[model samples]
Target: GDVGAGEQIFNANCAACHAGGQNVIMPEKTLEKEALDQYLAGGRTEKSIISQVTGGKNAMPAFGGRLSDEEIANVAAYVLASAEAGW
Candidate 1:
């Protein structure tokens, strides 16, 4: 997965809902490492993030139909990288 492409996709598609790792709809559900670890349960690996994004949960919308597997993988990479970078 391309980190650069992931950033672009995330900015365009996910930033509206999660800007700087903060969730507007669910403030308690942030994207930081701690929150991700707590909510994800499965851990904060790219595969886990990809699953959530592709399948969606609660108020989140499914993106499997809208994005290709490669794109989703890229987004997953971006998310993990961003979380590490404190973004």
Candidate 2:
């Protein structure tokens, strides 16, 4: 699942703000995996982040209808891997 779809989606959607490890200030957000996980975490697991990304929260802009389920899975899988392994 680390084929690169995640990078593609990030480039298309998240790169504008999270590029070069800098925080995107529009809605006061960052593309960092930890921050992202925290935002989505339901006080216990990182699964909520997946929900937030898919459903969108407030100014986050829901991506459910925008991206296919497979694409979402790929990207989210990449995010998880990149967070843990720095790939």
Candidate 3:
């Protein structure tokens, strides 16, 4: 995944709903490593992030059609990296 491109994509698409890894809708279900370790299906991995972004949960909107596959992959990388860094 392209981390640089991922950051740009995240700032543009994901920031509104997930600024600083916080979830506006469900505050407990944030992007933080600990929160994701419990809430995220399939746990917190790049593959899991990609699947979630592509398919989306109840409140989360699907990005499969909206974002290119490459974009999804990159953004997943960014999310996972950010989680690790306590973003």
Candidate 4:
């Protein structure tokens, strides 16, 4: 995925809640590697994260109907890459 496009998508749609890869609403669920490992590093992959972004969970709002598949994939890539880079 194009990290530049991913960054743009992420800043536009996800940065409010997930700035710096930190979850403002759920600190335990930060996008850092440790948190991802604890919660999603198991059987989950980037697809799993994409689904969550598309469908949402808990306080998160769903983007399935609002964003295109490619956009979702870009944001997913952003999340994974940002996590790896320690945001």
Number of clashes recorded per candidate: 0, 0, 0, 0
**Alpha-carbon TM-score of each model against the true structure:** 0.96, 0.68, 0.96, 0.90
Q: Give per-residue CA lDDT, model 1, range 1-87, as digits (tens).
A: 799999999998999989999999999788998889888858888999999999999999999999999999999999999988888
Off by over 4 Å in 2: 26-29, 33-37, 43-46
lDDT tens readout by residue for model 2, 22-72: 356644344455555454457213355467668986666788899877777
Q: Write one digit per residue (lDDT tens) for candidate 4, span 2-62.
A: 7788889999998999999989998898888778878663423578788788888889899
Q: Among all windows of ten consecutive residues in candidate 3, which has the lowest summed lDDT?
A: 8-17
State the local distance difference test value for candidate 1. Answer: 0.92
Candidate 1 wrongly placed segments (more than 4 Å): none
What's the CA RMSD of model 2 in angstroms?
Answer: 3.1
Error of 2 at 82 (Å): 2.1
Model 3 Cα lDDT, one tens digit per residue, 23-61: 999999999999989999999999999999999999899
Query: For each candidate, C-alpha RMSD in Å?
Result: 0.8, 3.1, 0.7, 1.6
Which residue pairs show collisions in model 2? none
* Deviation (Å) of 12 in candidate 2: 1.1
Candidates in descending TM-score order: 3, 1, 4, 2
